[PDB]
């Protein structure tokens, strides 16, 4: 004990002594409160934010809650794709100075999917890991992109010295029923994408995502099963 | 009754209690007058128009019977491919102080093929639905990408609350002996286009396009049989 | 009867049959809660807005009164500066799918600004009034560059049909103690860019104001005289 | 004899054996039937044209009455500045193929006035003549940028092998009773760039204008006279 | 009689009324003199030429021998690709102030292949005729993009009026023992795209081509077997 | 006591409890070893840099002596004009991973001067305070831009919470004989932007400046008053 | 005798009459000091450099060494891929006034590989060689594309007049255990593009690469063996 | 003796013991022939051009006599102006892959001065001293930019390590009768700038010029008289 700690309108679940869960919430029609998941990463003297919250304020809000229980700078952010419950908060981390980074491909499709583009683009190597010179100070934060799958730009976190991976909305918990939103999905690759993030963080056993509690590597395989019958 | 009604050069049929089918005509050396159609919409309190005439002053004479006939605003107008008889009228459309949309592609084409270009540029998802952050105020007007036919930026139109759905050129009426002009067509992807336009409107019954008057679905599977013979 | 309606966090008061000032508060340490003005024209079918409220919150709320109060589409939205108080709540403008318009300066002053410019840009004759080219459907708003004063981009509109003229933060009310926020101000040219307004509206008995209460025309000779004490 | 030819809604006034005057009207309420001036060129086996008419259709009844009363291809047209009477025809001579020319400036300003740009841009040196690289085949057209005066774009032309200047709006008859409109005059510099056309063509007897029938270099001096009290 | 002019370093040979083959030689170390082909066209009042000369200097001597056995203006000029035989003359043409036209494609490889750009840009439909927009006033020349062969980006010209079409340095005489240059060449779809030039000019009984004397259609059938032997 | 401390081949020396000098040399033929300096400032838990050092090796051993004395992360730093002694170091900045911000006129100037450009550029108001949207994070730098003397772009930088005011190379000690290099100097507005640093900072107390150690408020007037005699 | 000349941190090897290796070290975590290897060439009165060395402190090495042993000026250089030790020294160049080359890939891609692009993009043509109008004053450098491999953008030299071919890090010794550092390879073609280098330059004898002695031409054989296994 | 060496069309004349002035002719219609003069300079292994010839083919020449004569590489060319007789031969330069230079305003003005720009653009000091970065390798070369006179663009050069400087077409001999073409002519600036290249070469005693034989600084002189009478 003790529990998740309310904030706002916002959860936040501790993942790990340095590793924090933060949790919002969107009401749509029929589906009731969606949660979308992102993480907070203390690394050394400063916070590193993995994804925005649905909206601005909700945004603040995370902000607020660093301040309040972790006192340090957020030195970056970083999301996933340009979808609203990833991106939809990108103006308050403007306002606070705080510098963005997303896939080069997520800044090209922020316009078109109404998001606010990140001020810095990573790009990566063939194999799929981010070349470092486009994410400086990123730190214990290893950014892979697997390939087209919820998105064409989705991109996945692994978090050194943990044993946690964050794959966002390309992973779904072992579970689900299906793969949620596909409006934007590559139908084709998504399993192999799915895959590929799998082995790109092998060790990974605590498999964060957007919109289920934390699960175990079954996450991956049930989800690459369920992309298996796009194709 | 009664019937269509004769305003100036063009005529004007009522589909729906608001919807309305604008006709214009251009001489052709040999092919008699030939008929090119496009739709008007009223949603509300304003107006929508899809497609303009062959040329500025028809489309100005649209505009004309609008005020005459509905007596509201022309909110926008969008129009679904870069040829004389879809956007032969946008600058009557632009003097008006109307706000344009076509598909990206087709404002990308616009200057080769001797037309003006829209002022606003759509993008449709990888599924072929428009994204909405691109199409604001469309309210009734569905806008999905079918892929490459009759030209490789044809976009097609449903109309919410109504069984109609317009194919533009992509698709020929039932008995249409031939797939018309091909000068700019994607022989090779016409025919699957034309079928993702009938699943992207599964439920409409009368279907509209540029050429003939409204038909049944009987057109989109006899223009999809007829696109066959050319891969 | 009665008073100055009370709606969210804002106040509307009606200055004529179809224009209205909509007035916002931000906590500024030590000035107490800081109102700014601005202003909603009803123009026959559709509603006209000049500046936004400080926040995008506060300009969503804009839009729900008259929704609510006059319930007819916004066709436009045009911001006189590039400061917070003026265009502090474009997002929200845009999240509703409303065109905006600005001084195409205001627009290049915008980032440096921290300000999300407006998606059109106004351009001015060298006498000062709008080119109509570039300010499409503005009815009754009669748009006027009065040169640099407040800012180096302030303008000012009129309402045709009214005897109100809106000068924005160029001009201070007949009692002001001084011309305020000088940080972007033209120290030199503001004294003629304030006498040049009041001989644009000549006729205007009514002169709004971002932050007092609507005036005389005494407003404009007096701003006039304590710009005069500048160069 | 004869007259002056009516060809359509437009009138011909041969002014040389190579020269003729194109006349074309618009109706604006109040000031009646207002005409606009232009030039044809005929220079051995092509057609050089100075203006476009008020309108497209007007614009492309000019170049019928040049194919039946000629019959030689228009080489080029040239337009002396940004607005409707000068370039409102623009789109009829791109239709028909022929290579358009204006002052860089005018290109420039062309979509503040609501204008289509010509294709090529003039540029002249520092004495006002235009560069030669920038005009190519313009034969017997002599062009001269004189400096602000109606608009700042204004230029003007004079016909090699005749004694014909023409100044467009720049200049007025020997007895106007004001400069029109000067919605985007230069009051500044208006009487110097008079007086520099004047000295451009010091030998030119016939000084053809805008808006009435060709008149002497008494024109000229009017013209700045008129405009010395505008400074 | 009489037989092929010699005119300055050139040789012009008449092979229709309104039709001339002329011809420039390069000296290549070991290959003695290489002579390079084109065409000029008399189209009304205008002459019409395709291709350059290698030099700018005996471009220079084209244009002179039109002036004095035609003139008439040289309303324009076509390149058929960015090689130093077909646009090595470039300067000379816009000199004269000749309008030139080439593939667009020939424009963006120019600057790697040394060569100056033509100052419009022709595109073509996915047919592989001109999209005429982009070709005004080109008459009876036929303008076809065969696909990649030669080069990436050679075109076709065929002459209405005439059994003649233009192959340029796709196609070689009926008895050639190779290709030539395959440095640009796409060797894959060489075959296919000399093909393509044959239907699209069916009824076309002399074949002009760069490097050797006007042949029958068995120019086209023999290249086409050559080019199967490199895929 | 203690004295200076000597790192690598720079020396450091502690003006405030949170603010250090830090001085580089070059050897010039003739003007034996010149000193330039720089400022660091300890901002809470970050570091903050102004000036690089010449060369990129030493600014790397600036970074070196942060690491091993405060061990605090450099947040960003903020160089005063485009020269080898103020911006010769950025890769070394910039391959740490620092965030770099100059006059926006610096970066412009970079190229010409032979420098790397910052990441980032910093607008600056009518006033000559540093725009706060395009400074974030820069805490108790204050930013001022006092306008051309030593350089076209040269800025100014305040420490609040001190008595310090950096003037860089605008500024000399109180004895000097010269305003020394002078290549890029404004000699018309020099002795004014001395004086407006001044005014800029009047509670300043300790001077700093780039080849001279700290000095009092006479080095401000010295310097205008030797700036004086070139206008 | 004698052996190679050690300068510096650097080690020279000659090959030719008119070519020498250059080796500069890099310490890396485990793998000790890691030799990069570049080519220097003698062409009359100038020296042509191939490959940086891993830093710039290193490459102006190499450039004194040149002065002291040759004493001709550096015409140019050209760096065969975005990594460190092949383009980690471009600054060096630059600083020294020497006109740099690589491919325009390379260019794109040195960027995101925290490279400084070259001043001048080699283009290459459909075959691999480069086309000449992007190599000037290249002499004996024979430059070639294979296609992708060690990296997108590798490419190779040749040196004319002598038994040489500089395969860079595209190539292997005959007896390594493994092709390296994958992190920006193309499995797919690596192999054919080895074999691609051989066929490009058939006669060479000593295959000179990036991180082991010349080699014979098993070097080829052997690391398009090992690249067939990726495959 | 000897005297000056005649070869194919131009003249060459030794001013110092490595440095020769180029002299290029062209007829104009009722001058006769027109010289142009230009300089060559030798510098240790290398030779600099200053100014090409009127034409391509007299340029060329000028590099074959470079060969015969000196037989030495052409590191650079740096151009004086935008006008044909010394910019004319830009294209010979290039063929021949020579780096090539102007003033960053003679390339802006290149085309609408008919001229091909340089490859590089120079950028002066405030001082009209060349910023040394944008010149590298220049030697000798001392590039001065004296303000506008004969062109706003006019540059002028000093060769170290002699008495001469060259004036270009800003400066006459002391005895011409005015100073000639003033066409792109600043007459306000004319006389300014001319003893402002005074005062920049204060020792040089041998002044070269564009058209008339190297004088003494008694054509300086007398050029900036001649141009007082233009003020
Ligand atoms: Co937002
Ligand atoms: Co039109
Ligand atoms: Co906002
Ligand atoms: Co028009
Ligand atoms: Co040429
Ligand atoms: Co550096
Ligand atoms: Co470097
Ligand atoms: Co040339
Ligand atoms: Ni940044
Ligand atoms: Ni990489
Ligand atoms: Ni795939
Ligand atoms: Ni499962
Ligand atoms: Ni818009
Ligand atoms: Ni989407
Ligand atoms: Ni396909
Ligand atoms: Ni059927
Ligand atoms: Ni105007
Ligand atoms: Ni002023
Ligand atoms: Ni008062
Ligand atoms: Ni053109
Ligand atoms: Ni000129
Ligand atoms: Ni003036
Ligand atoms: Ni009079
Ligand atoms: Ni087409
Ligand atoms: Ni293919
Ligand atoms: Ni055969
Ligand atoms: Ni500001
Ligand atoms: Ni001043
Ligand atoms: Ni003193
Ligand atoms: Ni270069
Ligand atoms: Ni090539
Ligand atoms: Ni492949
Ligand atoms: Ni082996
Ligand atoms: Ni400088
Ligand atoms: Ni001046
Ligand atoms: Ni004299
Ligand atoms: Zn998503
Ligand atoms: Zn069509
Ligand atoms: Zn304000
Ligand atoms: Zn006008
Ligand atoms: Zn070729
Ligand atoms: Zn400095
Ligand atoms: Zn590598
Ligand atoms: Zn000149």
Known sequence: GPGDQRFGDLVFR????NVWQHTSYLDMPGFGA???????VRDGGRVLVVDTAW?????????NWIKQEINLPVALAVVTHAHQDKMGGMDALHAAGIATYANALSNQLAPQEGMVAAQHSLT??????????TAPNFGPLKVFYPGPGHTSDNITVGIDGTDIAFGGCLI???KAKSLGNLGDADTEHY???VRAFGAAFPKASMIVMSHSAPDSRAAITH???????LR
């Open 14 to 17: 501790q993942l790990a002594p």
């Open 34 to 40: 969606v949660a979308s998941n992102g993480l907070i």
């Open 55 to 63: 909206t601005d304020d909700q945004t603040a809000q995370i902000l």
């Open 124 to 133: 990566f190597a063939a194999n799929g890991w981010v070349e470092p010179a």
């Open 172 to 174: 779904k918990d072992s």
């Open 191 to 193: 399993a192999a994408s």
């Open 223 to 229: 989800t690459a099963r369920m992309a298996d019958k």
